[PDB]
Amino acid sequence: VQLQESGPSLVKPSQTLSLTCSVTGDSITNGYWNWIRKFPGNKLEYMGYISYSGSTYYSPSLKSRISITRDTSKNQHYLQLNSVTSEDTATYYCASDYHGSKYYFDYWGQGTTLTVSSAKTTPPSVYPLAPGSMVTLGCLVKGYFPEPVTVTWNSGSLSSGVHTFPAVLQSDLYTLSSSVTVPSSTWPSETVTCNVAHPASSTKVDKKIV
Amino acid sequence: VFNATRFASVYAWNRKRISNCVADYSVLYNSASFSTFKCYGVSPTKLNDLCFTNVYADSFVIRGDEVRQIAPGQTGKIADYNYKLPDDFTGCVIAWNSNNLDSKVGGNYNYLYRLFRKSNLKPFERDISTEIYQAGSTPCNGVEGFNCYFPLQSYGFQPTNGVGYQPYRVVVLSFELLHAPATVCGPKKSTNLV
Amino acid sequence: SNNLDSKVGGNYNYLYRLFRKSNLKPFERDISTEIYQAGSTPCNGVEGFNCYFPLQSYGFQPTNGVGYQPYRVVVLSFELLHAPATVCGPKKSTNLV
Amino acid sequence: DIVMTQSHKFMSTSVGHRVSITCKASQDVGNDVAWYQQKPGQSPKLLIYWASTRHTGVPDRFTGSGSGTDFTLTISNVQSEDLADYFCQQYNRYPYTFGGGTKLEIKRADAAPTVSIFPPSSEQLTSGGASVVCFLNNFYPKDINVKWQNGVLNSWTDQDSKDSTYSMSSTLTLTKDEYE
Amino acid sequence: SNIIRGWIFGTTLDSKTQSLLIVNNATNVVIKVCEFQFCNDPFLGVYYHKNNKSWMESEFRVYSSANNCTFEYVSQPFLMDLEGKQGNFKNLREFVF
């Protein structure tokens, strides 16, 4: 079967984090579904799983802050992570146990990014940079909090010549900086759209360079 | 062992007589199959090259915070009071969760454990007595009193409790390396007589 | 050292950094001694329109007192770590009979 | 608690040799060894199941065997595209708790990096900003003495697959009064 | 005839760790401990062996570059006799490492 990861991306600490992985293709009558967490820094921590009969197990990495529920009629699985903190920010995935054709299979889902923080939201200010064989364009993100946020070029479709720099430490806020390269054969016929999004406040800013 | 219906208490556990065979080393628990991952006594993978005389499948149900206390020569709340492994213990202790298997409506109060005792347990020694004995440095002198502790305690096996108080079924790989003629070996090829 | 680093009119041959982002780590050597430029017009190595010099030059004059006198500063750095102590003078002056 | 004892977090190898990743566990399974593979920027996929076959999309060079303590992942003729995260798990009993992890790298010789400093643009000076961008190419390893450090936003990328080197980009975010 | 000059020591003979080599270029006996980038075949070279040799050595094909040096020593300078004499072996040197 195929899973689809979902859930809220803004959860305050010392609360209950809920997720939803829907099963598409077959009902919850045979098989096993597990929940994993992908931490940055070459780490993959396992949390647990649930079964169709009702028996579940828990990983000994968490003492008493892990609980997995599901629903047979809704064909969805749930994850209840209690006592969240800033170190629990990781990428979530959903897997499924399946046997068939004399081989073992472990299908994977899509994945989602969840950010757990207690800081308040701050709307960013996007300001493009005018140029003055290759053309140098820029898009500065000044006045945003916290670090980091969603920042890409052409909605992730542009990867050649993209140089993403980390933020600097000002007195109160942070400031991003990024610059790409565009040849003169497309300038100024083709424009580059700077896409800066803020999932913590549902702010999506689209600025084009012209 | 893990496909059984239920296990007995920590003092009157149902063991299986295992002799004159080779254990199933084809499908076992290595890459953290269960919660508890502990081995004591000897090197943890020196089991196929050595033979063992008396093998018993000691299986009992404990809490979540008591699965790492079963160890030879190590103190604990159930090691020196309920079950003491012998000095020639060469196996491992590994337990899995049984919250949806051993629980019932209202809680299962059929499992008990001894918390205090007058002296430490001998190697390979068990006791099923439920009487009141000396707790610590101050004896109770019969009935519970004179500022002493209560030895006989009961497990709070409830399905609405925390994960640390859940019932956990254990399997004790009681491989004893004694001077007796051994019966259980590993899947190895022995040499000839030189 | 007023015999070599003291000239009439001011010694504008050496520079120093005026501003930066924040504080620096100990023993951070930066060899950036050229004129910074952020515009399109080249400054050609000299100052001019939109050609600022943040590396200001010092001033050494023989008519100045002890406030702006050239000090040949030699910093004697010492550090103890897990490495064995080697350079502080391996021997000393003793006597014998 | 699960104690997955490993020798080193990062293992060095070369193109054409044999990768040796050993999960030094304190137990034994037998003939059921499983391994994982997670490429950087992709989803974690199944790599080795039941210690004798492979998954869809897995080449024939990925295999795993061992007995007792040392379970060694065997990769013959390792290419530059085999830089991924490997984890130790099983498929015999539930739950499927993973292992520590091992990131691979290509052992090469060190070299002097190329320093190239570019001047900032004219649009940042009008708004009141500054950014001194300096690039460093063809260096090894990722942790060297960068020369042109405090306040400079250094960011190192992954290992290159052309000549087994690294790449990085460092900027100096300043203002109008700090640059002039 | 003064062909053997020194030796090359190290872990894997590259710039990964600190390497040890001694270069005898017929002027000084210098021992440096740096991270030398050794090639597939390091050696030396003497020019004009037939005529106008002048007992000097100029070519250096040991390593490409080096960084993070630890030890460096310069001995007493001398004049190495690079004359192509005929006869028996004259220099007998033993070394224990």
Side-chain angles (χ1 to χ4, degrees), chain B residues 40-70:
Chain B
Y40 299 92
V42 295
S43 301
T45 53
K46 199 179 181 180
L47 299 179
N48 300 329
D49 301 330
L50 300 179
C51 296
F52 316 104
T53 303
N54 299 330
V55 181
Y56 299 101
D58 304 329
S59 60
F60 47 87
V61 183
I62 60 262
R63 294 182 300 180
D65 299 330
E66 298 181 358
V67 290
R68 62 179 181 180
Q69 301 181 4
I70 303 297

PDB file of all heavy atoms in Angstrom, chain B residues 40-70:
ATOM      1  N   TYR B  40      25.509 -10.650  29.949  1.00  0.00           N
ATOM      2  CA  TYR B  40      26.466 -10.579  31.044  1.00  0.00           C
ATOM      3  C   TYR B  40      27.222 -11.896  31.149  1.00  0.00           C
ATOM      4  O   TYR B  40      26.914 -12.876  30.466  1.00  0.00           O
ATOM      5  CB  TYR B  40      25.776 -10.259  32.377  1.00  0.00           C
ATOM      6  CG  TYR B  40      25.051  -8.932  32.403  1.00  0.00           C
ATOM      7  CD1 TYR B  40      23.701  -8.849  32.077  1.00  0.00           C
ATOM      8  CD2 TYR B  40      25.714  -7.763  32.759  1.00  0.00           C
ATOM      9  CE1 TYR B  40      23.033  -7.637  32.101  1.00  0.00           C
ATOM     10  CE2 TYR B  40      25.055  -6.546  32.786  1.00  0.00           C
ATOM     11  CZ  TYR B  40      23.715  -6.491  32.457  1.00  0.00           C
ATOM     12  OH  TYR B  40      23.054  -5.285  32.483  1.00  0.00           O
ATOM     13  N   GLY B  41      28.227 -11.905  32.023  1.00  0.00           N
ATOM     14  CA  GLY B  41      28.984 -13.106  32.316  1.00  0.00           C
ATOM     15  C   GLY B  41      30.181 -13.333  31.414  1.00  0.00           C
ATOM     16  O   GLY B  41      31.330 -13.238  31.856  1.00  0.00           O
ATOM     17  N   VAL B  42      29.923 -13.634  30.143  1.00  0.00           N
ATOM     18  CA  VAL B  42      30.969 -13.967  29.182  1.00  0.00           C
ATOM     19  C   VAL B  42      30.809 -13.084  27.955  1.00  0.00           C
ATOM     20  O   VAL B  42      30.005 -12.143  27.957  1.00  0.00           O
ATOM     21  CB  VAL B  42      30.937 -15.455  28.783  1.00  0.00           C
ATOM     22  CG1 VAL B  42      31.262 -16.353  29.970  1.00  0.00           C
ATOM     23  CG2 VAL B  42      29.587 -15.809  28.179  1.00  0.00           C
ATOM     24  N   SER B  43      31.617 -13.344  26.931  1.00  0.00           N
ATOM     25  CA  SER B  43      31.444 -12.690  25.643  1.00  0.00           C
ATOM     26  C   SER B  43      30.074 -13.045  25.063  1.00  0.00           C
ATOM     27  O   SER B  43      29.654 -14.208  25.136  1.00  0.00           O
ATOM     28  CB  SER B  43      32.557 -13.107  24.678  1.00  0.00           C
ATOM     29  OG  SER B  43      33.832 -12.765  25.193  1.00  0.00           O
ATOM     30  N   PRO B  44      29.347 -12.074  24.499  1.00  0.00           N
ATOM     31  CA  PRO B  44      27.924 -12.294  24.186  1.00  0.00           C
ATOM     32  C   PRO B  44      27.667 -13.207  22.995  1.00  0.00           C
ATOM     33  O   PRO B  44      26.528 -13.665  22.833  1.00  0.00           O
ATOM     34  CB  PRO B  44      27.402 -10.877  23.908  1.00  0.00           C
ATOM     35  CG  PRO B  44      28.448  -9.948  24.455  1.00  0.00           C
ATOM     36  CD  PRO B  44      29.741 -10.672  24.288  1.00  0.00           C
ATOM     37  N   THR B  45      28.668 -13.483  22.158  1.00  0.00           N
ATOM     38  CA  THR B  45      28.488 -14.362  21.008  1.00  0.00           C
ATOM     39  C   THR B  45      29.302 -15.646  21.133  1.00  0.00           C
ATOM     40  O   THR B  45      29.540 -16.327  20.130  1.00  0.00           O
ATOM     41  CB  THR B  45      28.844 -13.635  19.709  1.00  0.00           C
ATOM     42  OG1 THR B  45      30.158 -13.073  19.816  1.00  0.00           O
ATOM     43  CG2 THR B  45      27.839 -12.527  19.429  1.00  0.00           C
ATOM     44  N   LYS B  46      29.734 -15.988  22.344  1.00  0.00           N
ATOM     45  CA  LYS B  46      30.468 -17.229  22.583  1.00  0.00           C
ATOM     46  C   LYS B  46      29.500 -18.297  23.093  1.00  0.00           C
ATOM     47  O   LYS B  46      29.564 -18.765  24.231  1.00  0.00           O
ATOM     48  CB  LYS B  46      31.617 -16.986  23.559  1.00  0.00           C
ATOM     49  CG  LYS B  46      32.707 -18.048  23.526  1.00  0.00           C
ATOM     50  CD  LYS B  46      33.823 -17.722  24.505  1.00  0.00           C
ATOM     51  CE  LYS B  46      34.920 -18.773  24.466  1.00  0.00           C
ATOM     52  NZ  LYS B  46      36.023 -18.454  25.414  1.00  0.00           N
ATOM     53  N   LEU B  47      28.575 -18.671  22.211  1.00  0.00           N
ATOM     54  CA  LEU B  47      27.553 -19.660  22.524  1.00  0.00           C
ATOM     55  C   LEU B  47      27.592 -20.890  21.631  1.00  0.00           C
ATOM     56  O   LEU B  47      27.272 -21.983  22.102  1.00  0.00           O
ATOM     57  CB  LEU B  47      26.153 -19.031  22.435  1.00  0.00           C
ATOM     58  CG  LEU B  47      25.866 -17.872  23.390  1.00  0.00           C
ATOM     59  CD1 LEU B  47      24.456 -17.341  23.182  1.00  0.00           C
ATOM     60  CD2 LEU B  47      26.071 -18.304  24.834  1.00  0.00           C
ATOM     61  N   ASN B  48      27.969 -20.745  20.358  1.00  0.00           N
ATOM     62  CA  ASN B  48      28.015 -21.894  19.462  1.00  0.00           C
ATOM     63  C   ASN B  48      29.252 -22.751  19.691  1.00  0.00           C
ATOM     64  O   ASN B  48      29.198 -23.972  19.502  1.00  0.00           O
ATOM     65  CB  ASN B  48      27.963 -21.427  18.007  1.00  0.00           C
ATOM     66  CG  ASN B  48      26.698 -20.657  17.687  1.00  0.00           C
ATOM     67  OD1 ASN B  48      25.642 -20.903  18.270  1.00  0.00           O
ATOM     68  ND2 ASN B  48      26.799 -19.715  16.756  1.00  0.00           N
ATOM     69  N   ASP B  49      30.366 -22.143  20.098  1.00  0.00           N
ATOM     70  CA  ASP B  49      31.600 -22.881  20.328  1.00  0.00           C
ATOM     71  C   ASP B  49      31.662 -23.529  21.705  1.00  0.00           C
ATOM     72  O   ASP B  49      32.616 -24.264  21.981  1.00  0.00           O
ATOM     73  CB  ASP B  49      32.807 -21.957  20.145  1.00  0.00           C
ATOM     74  CG  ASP B  49      32.874 -21.354  18.755  1.00  0.00           C
ATOM     75  OD1 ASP B  49      32.406 -22.008  17.799  1.00  0.00           O
ATOM     76  OD2 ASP B  49      33.396 -20.228  18.618  1.00  0.00           O
ATOM     77  N   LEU B  50      30.680 -23.279  22.567  1.00  0.00           N
ATOM     78  CA  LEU B  50      30.647 -23.842  23.907  1.00  0.00           C
ATOM     79  C   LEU B  50      29.379 -24.663  24.097  1.00  0.00           C
ATOM     80  O   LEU B  50      28.326 -24.352  23.530  1.00  0.00           O
ATOM     81  CB  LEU B  50      30.720 -22.742  24.975  1.00  0.00           C
ATOM     82  CG  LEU B  50      31.969 -21.859  24.961  1.00  0.00           C
ATOM     83  CD1 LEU B  50      31.896 -20.809  26.059  1.00  0.00           C
ATOM     84  CD2 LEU B  50      33.227 -22.702  25.104  1.00  0.00           C
ATOM     85  N   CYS B  51      29.491 -25.715  24.900  1.00  0.00           N
ATOM     86  CA  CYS B  51      28.375 -26.590  25.220  1.00  0.00           C
ATOM     87  C   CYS B  51      27.901 -26.327  26.644  1.00  0.00           C
ATOM     88  O   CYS B  51      28.678 -25.912  27.508  1.00  0.00           O
ATOM     89  CB  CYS B  51      28.766 -28.061  25.066  1.00  0.00           C
ATOM     90  SG  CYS B  51      29.179 -28.573  23.383  1.00  0.00           S
ATOM     91  N   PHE B  52      26.614 -26.574  26.881  1.00  0.00           N
ATOM     92  CA  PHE B  52      25.991 -26.294  28.165  1.00  0.00           C
ATOM     93  C   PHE B  52      25.239 -27.524  28.654  1.00  0.00           C
ATOM     94  O   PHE B  52      24.632 -28.255  27.867  1.00  0.00           O
ATOM     95  CB  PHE B  52      25.042 -25.094  28.069  1.00  0.00           C
ATOM     96  CG  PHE B  52      25.611 -23.937  27.298  1.00  0.00           C
ATOM     97  CD1 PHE B  52      25.187 -23.676  26.003  1.00  0.00           C
ATOM     98  CD2 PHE B  52      26.586 -23.125  27.860  1.00  0.00           C
ATOM     99  CE1 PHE B  52      25.714 -22.613  25.286  1.00  0.00           C
ATOM    100  CE2 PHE B  52      27.118 -22.064  27.149  1.00  0.00           C
ATOM    101  CZ  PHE B  52      26.681 -21.807  25.860  1.00  0.00           C
ATOM    102  N   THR B  53      25.287 -27.744  29.969  1.00  0.00           N
ATOM    103  CA  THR B  53      24.680 -28.935  30.553  1.00  0.00           C
ATOM    104  C   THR B  53      23.185 -28.750  30.789  1.00  0.00           C
ATOM    105  O   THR B  53      22.360 -29.465  30.208  1.00  0.00           O
ATOM    106  CB  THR B  53      25.382 -29.294  31.866  1.00  0.00           C
ATOM    107  OG1 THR B  53      26.781 -29.492  31.628  1.00  0.00           O
ATOM    108  CG2 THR B  53      24.787 -30.564  32.454  1.00  0.00           C
ATOM    109  N   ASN B  54      22.819 -27.795  31.637  1.00  0.00           N
ATOM    110  CA  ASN B  54      21.436 -27.589  32.050  1.00  0.00           C
ATOM    111  C   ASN B  54      20.908 -26.311  31.413  1.00  0.00           C
ATOM    112  O   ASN B  54      21.410 -25.217  31.695  1.00  0.00           O
ATOM    113  CB  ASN B  54      21.327 -27.517  33.573  1.00  0.00           C
ATOM    114  CG  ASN B  54      21.784 -28.793  34.251  1.00  0.00           C
ATOM    115  OD1 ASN B  54      21.668 -29.883  33.690  1.00  0.00           O
ATOM    116  ND2 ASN B  54      22.308 -28.664  35.464  1.00  0.00           N
ATOM    117  N   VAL B  55      19.897 -26.452  30.560  1.00  0.00           N
ATOM    118  CA  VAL B  55      19.249 -25.329  29.895  1.00  0.00           C
ATOM    119  C   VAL B  55      17.795 -25.288  30.338  1.00  0.00           C
ATOM    120  O   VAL B  55      17.073 -26.283  30.205  1.00  0.00           O
ATOM    121  CB  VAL B  55      19.351 -25.436  28.362  1.00  0.00           C
ATOM    122  CG1 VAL B  55      18.691 -24.236  27.700  1.00  0.00           C
ATOM    123  CG2 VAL B  55      20.805 -25.556  27.930  1.00  0.00           C
ATOM    124  N   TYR B  56      17.370 -24.143  30.869  1.00  0.00           N
ATOM    125  CA  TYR B  56      16.001 -23.948  31.319  1.00  0.00           C
ATOM    126  C   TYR B  56      15.438 -22.679  30.699  1.00  0.00           C
ATOM    127  O   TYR B  56      16.119 -21.651  30.641  1.00  0.00           O
ATOM    128  CB  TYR B  56      15.919 -23.864  32.848  1.00  0.00           C
ATOM    129  CG  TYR B  56      16.389 -25.113  33.557  1.00  0.00           C
ATOM    130  CD1 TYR B  56      17.657 -25.177  34.124  1.00  0.00           C
ATOM    131  CD2 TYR B  56      15.567 -26.230  33.659  1.00  0.00           C
ATOM    132  CE1 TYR B  56      18.094 -26.318  34.776  1.00  0.00           C
ATOM    133  CE2 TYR B  56      15.993 -27.376  34.308  1.00  0.00           C
ATOM    134  CZ  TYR B  56      17.257 -27.414  34.863  1.00  0.00           C
ATOM    135  OH  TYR B  56      17.686 -28.551  35.509  1.00  0.00           O
ATOM    136  N   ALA B  57      14.189 -22.756  30.238  1.00  0.00           N
ATOM    137  CA  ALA B  57      13.511 -21.612  29.630  1.00  0.00           C
ATOM    138  C   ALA B  57      12.736 -20.876  30.718  1.00  0.00           C
ATOM    139  O   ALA B  57      11.517 -20.998  30.857  1.00  0.00           O
ATOM    140  CB  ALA B  57      12.606 -22.065  28.491  1.00  0.00           C
ATOM    141  N   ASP B  58      13.471 -20.093  31.504  1.00  0.00           N
ATOM    142  CA  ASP B  58      12.886 -19.320  32.594  1.00  0.00           C
ATOM    143  C   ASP B  58      12.181 -18.101  32.009  1.00  0.00           C
ATOM    144  O   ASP B  58      12.828 -17.208  31.454  1.00  0.00           O
ATOM    145  CB  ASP B  58      13.961 -18.909  33.594  1.00  0.00           C
ATOM    146  CG  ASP B  58      14.734 -20.094  34.139  1.00  0.00           C
ATOM    147  OD1 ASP B  58      14.145 -21.190  34.247  1.00  0.00           O
ATOM    148  OD2 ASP B  58      15.930 -19.930  34.459  1.00  0.00           O
ATOM    149  N   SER B  59      10.856 -18.064  32.130  1.00  0.00           N
ATOM    150  CA  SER B  59      10.051 -16.977  31.591  1.00  0.00           C
ATOM    151  C   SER B  59       9.125 -16.451  32.676  1.00  0.00           C
ATOM    152  O   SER B  59       8.350 -17.216  33.261  1.00  0.00           O
ATOM    153  CB  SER B  59       9.237 -17.442  30.378  1.00  0.00           C
ATOM    154  OG  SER B  59       8.360 -18.499  30.726  1.00  0.00           O
ATOM    155  N   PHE B  60       9.205 -15.149  32.939  1.00  0.00           N
ATOM    156  CA  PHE B  60       8.346 -14.509  33.924  1.00  0.00           C
ATOM    157  C   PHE B  60       7.995 -13.112  33.432  1.00  0.00           C
ATOM    158  O   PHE B  60       8.553 -12.617  32.449  1.00  0.00           O
ATOM    159  CB  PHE B  60       9.001 -14.472  35.315  1.00  0.00           C
ATOM    160  CG  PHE B  60      10.436 -14.006  35.315  1.00  0.00           C
ATOM    161  CD1 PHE B  60      10.743 -12.655  35.405  1.00  0.00           C
ATOM    162  CD2 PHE B  60      11.479 -14.922  35.257  1.00  0.00           C
ATOM    163  CE1 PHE B  60      12.059 -12.224  35.419  1.00  0.00           C
ATOM    164  CE2 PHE B  60      12.797 -14.499  35.266  1.00  0.00           C
ATOM    165  CZ  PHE B  60      13.087 -13.148  35.347  1.00  0.00           C
ATOM    166  N   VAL B  61       7.057 -12.477  34.129  1.00  0.00           N
ATOM    167  CA  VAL B  61       6.521 -11.177  33.739  1.00  0.00           C
ATOM    168  C   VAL B  61       6.918 -10.158  34.799  1.00  0.00           C
ATOM    169  O   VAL B  61       6.620 -10.341  35.986  1.00  0.00           O
ATOM    170  CB  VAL B  61       4.994 -11.219  33.564  1.00  0.00           C
ATOM    171  CG1 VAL B  61       4.481  -9.877  33.081  1.00  0.00           C
ATOM    172  CG2 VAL B  61       4.599 -12.325  32.597  1.00  0.00           C
ATOM    173  N   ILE B  62       7.586  -9.088  34.369  1.00  0.00           N
ATOM    174  CA  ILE B  62       8.008  -7.999  35.238  1.00  0.00           C
ATOM    175  C   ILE B  62       7.539  -6.681  34.628  1.00  0.00           C
ATOM    176  O   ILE B  62       6.862  -6.654  33.601  1.00  0.00           O
ATOM    177  CB  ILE B  62       9.535  -7.980  35.473  1.00  0.00           C
ATOM    178  CG1 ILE B  62      10.301  -7.819  34.147  1.00  0.00           C
ATOM    179  CG2 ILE B  62       9.976  -9.194  36.300  1.00  0.00           C
ATOM    180  CD1 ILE B  62      10.839  -9.109  33.521  1.00  0.00           C
ATOM    181  N   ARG B  63       7.910  -5.581  35.278  1.00  0.00           N
ATOM    182  CA  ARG B  63       7.548  -4.249  34.810  1.00  0.00           C
ATOM    183  C   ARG B  63       8.548  -3.785  33.751  1.00  0.00           C
ATOM    184  O   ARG B  63       9.432  -4.530  33.319  1.00  0.00           O
ATOM    185  CB  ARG B  63       7.471  -3.277  35.984  1.00  0.00           C
ATOM    186  CG  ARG B  63       6.351  -3.573  36.964  1.00  0.00           C
ATOM    187  CD  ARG B  63       6.303  -2.537  38.077  1.00  0.00           C
ATOM    188  NE  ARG B  63       7.547  -2.496  38.840  1.00  0.00           N
ATOM    189  CZ  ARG B  63       7.767  -1.678  39.865  1.00  0.00           C
ATOM    190  NH1 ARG B  63       6.825  -0.830  40.253  1.00  0.00           N
ATOM    191  NH2 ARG B  63       8.930  -1.709  40.502  1.00  0.00           N
ATOM    192  N   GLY B  64       8.419  -2.531  33.323  1.00  0.00           N
ATOM    193  CA  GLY B  64       9.295  -1.979  32.310  1.00  0.00           C
ATOM    194  C   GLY B  64      10.644  -1.545  32.846  1.00  0.00           C
ATOM    195  O   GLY B  64      11.647  -1.587  32.128  1.00  0.00           O
ATOM    196  N   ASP B  65      10.681  -1.123  34.108  1.00  0.00           N
ATOM    197  CA  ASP B  65      11.909  -0.671  34.746  1.00  0.00           C
ATOM    198  C   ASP B  65      12.649  -1.791  35.466  1.00  0.00           C
ATOM    199  O   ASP B  65      13.638  -1.521  36.155  1.00  0.00           O
ATOM    200  CB  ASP B  65      11.606   0.464  35.727  1.00  0.00           C
ATOM    201  CG  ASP B  65      10.991   1.672  35.048  1.00  0.00           C
ATOM    202  OD1 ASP B  65      11.293   1.905  33.859  1.00  0.00           O
ATOM    203  OD2 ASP B  65      10.205   2.388  35.704  1.00  0.00           O
ATOM    204  N   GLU B  66      12.197  -3.037  35.324  1.00  0.00           N
ATOM    205  CA  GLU B  66      12.826  -4.176  35.982  1.00  0.00           C
ATOM    206  C   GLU B  66      13.339  -5.216  34.994  1.00  0.00           C
ATOM    207  O   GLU B  66      13.662  -6.337  35.404  1.00  0.00           O
ATOM    208  CB  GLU B  66      11.848  -4.828  36.965  1.00  0.00           C
ATOM    209  CG  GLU B  66      11.398  -3.916  38.095  1.00  0.00           C
ATOM    210  CD  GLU B  66      10.444  -4.601  39.051  1.00  0.00           C
ATOM    211  OE1 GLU B  66      10.098  -5.777  38.808  1.00  0.00           O
ATOM    212  OE2 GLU B  66      10.037  -3.966  40.046  1.00  0.00           O
ATOM    213  N   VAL B  67      13.423  -4.879  33.706  1.00  0.00           N
ATOM    214  CA  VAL B  67      13.881  -5.845  32.714  1.00  0.00           C
ATOM    215  C   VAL B  67      15.400  -5.928  32.639  1.00  0.00           C
ATOM    216  O   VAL B  67      15.932  -6.920  32.123  1.00  0.00           O
ATOM    217  CB  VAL B  67      13.309  -5.512  31.326  1.00  0.00           C
ATOM    218  CG1 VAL B  67      11.813  -5.773  31.294  1.00  0.00           C
ATOM    219  CG2 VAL B  67      13.608  -4.066  30.962  1.00  0.00           C
ATOM    220  N   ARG B  68      16.116  -4.921  33.138  1.00  0.00           N
ATOM    221  CA  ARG B  68      17.571  -4.905  33.111  1.00  0.00           C
ATOM    222  C   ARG B  68      18.186  -5.276  34.454  1.00  0.00           C
ATOM    223  O   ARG B  68      19.410  -5.211  34.601  1.00  0.00           O
ATOM    224  CB  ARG B  68      18.074  -3.530  32.669  1.00  0.00           C
ATOM    225  CG  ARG B  68      17.680  -2.395  33.598  1.00  0.00           C
ATOM    226  CD  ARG B  68      18.242  -1.067  33.117  1.00  0.00           C
ATOM    227  NE  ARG B  68      17.890   0.031  34.013  1.00  0.00           N
ATOM    228  CZ  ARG B  68      18.263   1.294  33.828  1.00  0.00           C
ATOM    229  NH1 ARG B  68      19.000   1.622  32.776  1.00  0.00           N
ATOM    230  NH2 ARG B  68      17.897   2.229  34.694  1.00  0.00           N
ATOM    231  N   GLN B  69      17.369  -5.662  35.432  1.00  0.00           N
ATOM    232  CA  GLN B  69      17.872  -6.016  36.753  1.00  0.00           C
ATOM    233  C   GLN B  69      18.284  -7.476  36.865  1.00  0.00           C
ATOM    234  O   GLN B  69      19.058  -7.818  37.766  1.00  0.00           O
ATOM    235  CB  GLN B  69      16.818  -5.703  37.820  1.00  0.00           C
ATOM    236  CG  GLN B  69      16.397  -4.242  37.860  1.00  0.00           C
ATOM    237  CD  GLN B  69      15.377  -3.959  38.946  1.00  0.00           C
ATOM    238  OE1 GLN B  69      15.028  -4.840  39.731  1.00  0.00           O
ATOM    239  NE2 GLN B  69      14.894  -2.723  38.996  1.00  0.00           N
ATOM    240  N   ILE B  70      17.792  -8.341  35.979  1.00  0.00           N
ATOM    241  CA  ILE B  70      18.138  -9.761  35.996  1.00  0.00           C
ATOM    242  C   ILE B  70      19.542  -9.892  35.409  1.00  0.00           C
ATOM    243  O   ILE B  70      19.726  -9.856  34.192  1.00  0.00           O
ATOM    244  CB  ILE B  70      17.120 -10.607  35.228  1.00  0.00           C
ATOM    245  CG1 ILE B  70      15.717 -10.398  35.799  1.00  0.00           C
ATOM    246  CG2 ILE B  70      17.493 -12.081  35.288  1.00  0.00           C
ATOM    247  CD1 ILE B  70      15.571 -10.835  37.241  1.00  0.00           C
TER     248      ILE B  70
END
